[PDB]
Amino acid sequence: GMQKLTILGATGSIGASTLKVIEQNPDKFSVVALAADSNVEKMQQLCQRWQPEYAVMANKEAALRLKMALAVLAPNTQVLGGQEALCYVATLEQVDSVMAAIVGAAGLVPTMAAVKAGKRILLANKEALVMSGQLFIDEVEKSGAQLLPVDSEHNAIFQCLPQTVQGNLGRCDLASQGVSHILLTGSGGPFRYTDVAELEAVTPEQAIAPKISVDSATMMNKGLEYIEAKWLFNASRDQLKVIIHPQSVIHSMVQYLDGSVLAQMGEPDMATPIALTLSYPERVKAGVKPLDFTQVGELTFLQPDFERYPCLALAIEACYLGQHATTTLNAANEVAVAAFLARQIKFTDIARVNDSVLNQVCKQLDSLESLLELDRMARTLADEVVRERA
Amino acid sequence: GMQKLTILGATGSIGASTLKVIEQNPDKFSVVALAADSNVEKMQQLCQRWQPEYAVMANKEAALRLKMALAVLAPNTQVLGGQEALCYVATLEQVDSVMAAIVGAAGLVPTMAAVKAGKRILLANKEALVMSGQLFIDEVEKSGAQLLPVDSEHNAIFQCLPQTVQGNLGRCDLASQGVSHILLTGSGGPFRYTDVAELEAVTPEQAIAHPNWSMGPKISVDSATMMNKGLEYIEAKWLFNASRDQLKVIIHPQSVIHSMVQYLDGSVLAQMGEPDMATPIALTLSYPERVKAGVKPLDFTQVGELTFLQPDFERYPCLALAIEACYLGQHATTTLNAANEVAVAAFLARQIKFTDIARVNDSVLNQVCKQSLDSLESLLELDRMARTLADEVVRERA
């Protein structure tokens, strides 16, 4: 039958890619609610095109402006505002799936509301597993919600795993389904061939080839992905390897016990992984062409050097320590990057800030509230370490 | 519980790879019968190690020599000889799976006997589908036998396909499980970068060199002409029920990727691994589970660069013939396969040039299908007729 969707985070690239898949499959997917942060203009255009039952701005002042516009552009769309309203559209009885694409800590509560209601969760918020991995997996178990990862690397891993593990994410023992290890691939960022010595002098201009760009450059992006993969797939440290693949044609791979490797490849378009999150276990047209082997060029592989990418080592370390450490590390890194971009600290100080803060905190029963509180503490400590370094 | 095996073709590399996997999993697999053609020395050593209930030599004279060697060294091994005995061990009530690794046309009857008995078939004979695809698929359907492909390409495709297709091979509509197409992958052979003009003069030595897998002379030459990929195309049609829109061919020179499947959402699944036949075998034995195969995980720090090319039909005319033969049906694929056996043997005998292989294949195929209810017997007969014609065309070329 028709699958009914709420899209949390409708005005960014993920939202757009989701809508493109839905546009290719009007017989299968129906948009009940669209929700966003504060890009009212884009949201007006989308409510006009999609005429959803509900439209929600996270910001109440932004909601008011949208309401005025939709009196005219989408008169049958009920406009709402605030966090409560995000939870309300994420938990509607008629809704089957929730694209959880509101980014940052503000995404936690609405995503979790969808989990507690037993929805299918198309997970495109990093914070849910980076900050609150154990909570999320427990609440998913308790409600019977289905979790499907949107992000490219996770989605590729998901596709490369057997059906038995796919249907029971975060609870299968991987060794028992024949998995030796997961190969999380990444481009290595723009400093992949740069001599370690030259990293000290790197500028924000160079690092950007904004926040997510700097994370690419440090491989903190991959670290956070590693942490998420641990929770999504219940992988131990022996089961999770990071491989640099500079061309990003392969999006990730799984090594099996018999020697077999499965890899997922394709054109660089988020509609591909999204489309599977919506259609699983079936497949649908995504508006993405088949891979052109005439243009992929050479594929190569490198082992990450932890001297080049110290943030990657920290994230791996933090992962073994648990939720408190991953929350701490994620928070500290937001502050550290903001400081680098503000010119206050060198590129290589990002890891130093992260490393001090992490060491300070972990030298000493969780909720989303207590973890947000730790996130704030960690930020305060990072502000102080940033000061020591200027 | 314990899976019971008959191995047809125990003394070659496939047999050895199968026995390596079994040796890693004594709690899961047990060998009921071993069968071979005339390598008594190797069979004696294997019967001594495995002490199977039955040992069969295809050649009755060889069976007699084995029987004498085994009286004491393997006293509980009943030794048998001939074709009837191959069918008997392939159809035993206690046997669950049959590694069908007897190569050539001689493999047809025993492999078919296992099919008709409803066994799990670990298919490692090309001829079953190249010569008699339609027959095999129909008999598999009737008996409830399971076909699991051993060959590297097919096994990779199998792994890149969804569980629903995997459990119902040759019966599923591929479009309906989201498949756009299968990408059949080949190395391109040692002449992949060679100018077409220089192909005329190439030698057997050149044709056999720098291989990514261990292969005998014939299969190596087929790799050089891309006849290998053509035959595999024909098999893939029967095995996956793939239409003319669903089967493509691509060159991947390093043979790290073994095959790939393109899906409707843009997603491509690829199977990769060390060039060790224990990997695909192991899955044919363990499916839907997995087992240790004695093969190391792939080391991505040593695979080097992966690249892709497109086959040029001027460099690979056999590939065009195979595709054409596939559209024409069983008679044409049987004819082509037979003609190519003769043509390659002639090239290796230094009677014809490398580029005469396609010319011989092309004449023979044209002659037969210009001039117009199948059985294994009638298809063997066509194979012999096509061989006679190929012998004649080889003579014209020397």
Angstrom distances, CA of residue B377 to CA of A348, B106, B109, B277: 75, 11, 9, 31
Helix (H, G, I), strand (E, B) or coil at A330: helix
Q: Are A32 and A97 in contact (CB under 8 A)?
A: no
Size of interface A-B (CB pairs under 8 A): 143
In what side-by-side order are the strands of the sheet with B268-272? A240-244, A179-186, A250-256, A261-265, B268-272, B257-263, B179-186, B247-251
Indicate the resolution in Å. Answer: 2.3
Q: Are B262 and A290 in contact (CB under 8 A)?
A: yes
Residue window 296-325, chain B: list those with CB within 8 Å of chain A: 296-298, 300-301, 303-308, 310
Residue B352 DSSP label: S
Is A1-151 assigned to CATH 3.40.50.720? yes
Report the run of H or E that residue B66 belongs to, with start and end: helix B60-73
CA distance B54 to chain A (A): 28
A142 is in an annotated binding site: no
Contact residues on chain B for A178, CB-CB shorter than 8 A? 289-291
Residues of the binding site of B for 1-deoxy-D-xylulose 5-phosphate: 126, 152-153, 187, 210, 223, 228-229, 232
Residue A185 β-bridge partners: A243
Residue A262 DSSP label: E
- What is the b/e burial string over A326-357, where b = at least 16 CB atoms within 10 angstroms of the residue's CB? bbbbbbbbbbbbbbbbeeebbbebbbbbbbbb
For residue A376, give the nearest of A339, A327, A311 by alpha carbon.
A327
Helix (H, G, I), strand (E, B) or coil at B226: coil
Find the CB nearest A283 among B265, B282, B297: B265
**What is the rounded CA–CA span in Å between residue B141 and residue A73?**
59
Torsion region of B248: left, alpha or beta (phi above 0 gives left; psi -120 to 50 gives alpha): beta
CATH architecture of A306-390: Orthogonal Bundle (1.10)
Label the pairing between strands B146-149 and B120-123: parallel
**Amino acid, res. B248:** K
Give 3-state DSSP helix, strand, coil % of chain A, rounded to 5. Answer: 50, 15, 35
Tokens standing for residue B206? 């050149």
- Tell me: cis bond preceding A281? Omega within 30 of 0 counts: yes
**What is the rounded CA–CA span in Å between residue B376 and residue B138?**
13
Tokens standing for residue A11? 């005005």
**What is the rounded CA–CA span in Å between residue A224 and residue A128?**
11
Q: Which long-range contacts (CB under 8 A, 24 or more apart) does A95-98 make?
A: A95/A4, A95/A5, A95/A6, A95/A32, A95/A33, A95/A119, A96/A3, A96/A4, A96/A5, A96/A120, A97/A3, A97/A4, A97/A5, A97/A6, A97/A121, A97/A122, A97/A278, A98/A5, A98/A6, A98/A7, A98/A8, A98/A122
> Would you call A290 and B268 a contact, using CB atoms and an 8 Å cutoff?
yes
CA distance A319 to chain B (A): 24
> Would you call B282 and A258 a contact, using CB atoms and an 8 Å cutoff?
yes
Q: Are A86 and A92 in contact (CB under 8 A)?
A: no
Contact residues on chain B for A281, CB-CB shorter than 8 A? 162
Q: Which residues, including other chains, have CB under 8 Å from residue A306's CB and lie 6 or more apart?
A: A312, A313
Pinpoint the residues of chain A covered by CATH 1.10.1740.10. 306-390
**DSSP-assigned letters across all residues of A28-94:** TEEEEEEEESS-HHHHHHHHHHH--SEEEESSHHHHHHHHHHHHHH-TTPEEEESHHHHHHHHS-TT
Find the CB nearest A265 among B270, B289, B290: B270
Report the run of H or E that residue B378 belongs to, with start and end: helix B376-396
Cα angle, residue B173 at apex, residues B172 and B177 outer, rounded to 5°: 90
**What is the rounded CA–CA span in Å between residue A51 and residue A78?**
10
In what side-by-side order are the strands of the sheet with B54-57? B78-81, B54-57, B29-36, B3-8, B97-100, B120-123, B146-149
Q: Are A260 and B159 in contact (CB under 8 A)?
A: yes
Q: Are A273 and A152 in contact (CB under 8 A)?
A: yes
Angstrom distances, CA of residue A237 to CA of A250, A269, B165: 22, 30, 33
**Amino acid, res. B162:** P
- Tell me: cis bond preceding A310? Omega within 30 of 0 counts: no
What counts of helices (H) and strands (E) characterise chain B?
A: 16, 11
Pinpoint the residues of chain B covered by CATH 1.10.1740.10. 313-398
Q: Is B177 on the interface with A (CB under 8 A)?
A: yes
> If you measure CA to CA, which chain B residue comes closest to A246?
B305
Helix (H, G, I), strand (E, B) or coil at A255: strand
Q: Is B40 on the interface with A (CB under 8 A)?
A: no
Tokens standing for residue A111? 């995503």
Up-side HSE of residue B294: CA atoms within 13 Å toward CB? 14
> If you measure CA to CA, which chain B residue comes closest to A178?
B290
**What is the rounded CA–CA span in Å between residue B215 and residue A312?**
43
Pinpoint the residues of chain B covered by CATH 3.40.50.720. 1-151
Residue window 151-170, chain A: list those with CB within 8 Å of chain B: 159-160, 162-163
Residue A299 DSSP label: B
**What is the rounded CA–CA span in Å between residue B352 and residue B344?**
9
Q: How far, in whole angstroms, is CA B102 from its chain's centroid?
A: 10
Q: Are B358 and B340 in contact (CB under 8 A)?
A: no
Report the run of H or E that residue B235 belongs to, with start and end: helix B227-240
**What is the rounded CA–CA span in Å between residue B57 and residue A135?**
63
Beta strands in chain B (DSSP E): 3-8, 29-36, 54-57, 78-81, 97-100, 120-123, 146-149, 179-186, 247-251, 257-263, 268-272
Domain topology for B313-398: Rna Polymerase Sigma Factor; Chain: A (1.10.1740)
Q: Is B11 on the interface with A (CB under 8 A)?
A: no
> Would you call B291 and A258 a contact, using CB atoms and an 8 Å cutoff?
yes
**DSSP-assigned letters across all residues of B124-187:** --SHHHHHHHHHHHHHHHHHT-EEEE-SHHHHHHHHHS-HHHHTTTTTS-SGGGTEEEEEEEE-
Cα angle, residue B25 at apex, residues A234 and A166 outer, rounded to 5°: 25
**What is the rounded CA–CA span in Å between residue A172 and residue A106?**
30
- Write down the H helix ranges in A76-168: 83-90, 108-116, 127-143, 152-160, 163-166
Report the run of H or E that residue A178 belongs to, with start and end: none
For residue B71, with 0-12 CB atoms within 10 Å meaning exposed, 13-18 middle and 19 or more buried, which class applies?
exposed
> Would you call A259 and B306 a contact, using CB atoms and an 8 Å cutoff?
no
Q: Method of determination? A: X-ray
Residue B121 β-bridge partners: B98, B147
Q: Are A31 and A51 in contact (CB under 8 A)?
A: no
For residue A48, give the nearest of A22, A75, A28 by alpha carbon.
A75
- What is the b/e burial string over A258-276, where b = at least 16 CB atoms within 10 angstroms of the residue's CB? bbbbbbbbbbebbbbbbbb
**Amino acid, res. A208:** I
Q: From the CB of residue A201, how many other CB atoms can be counted at a distance below 10 Å?
A: 10
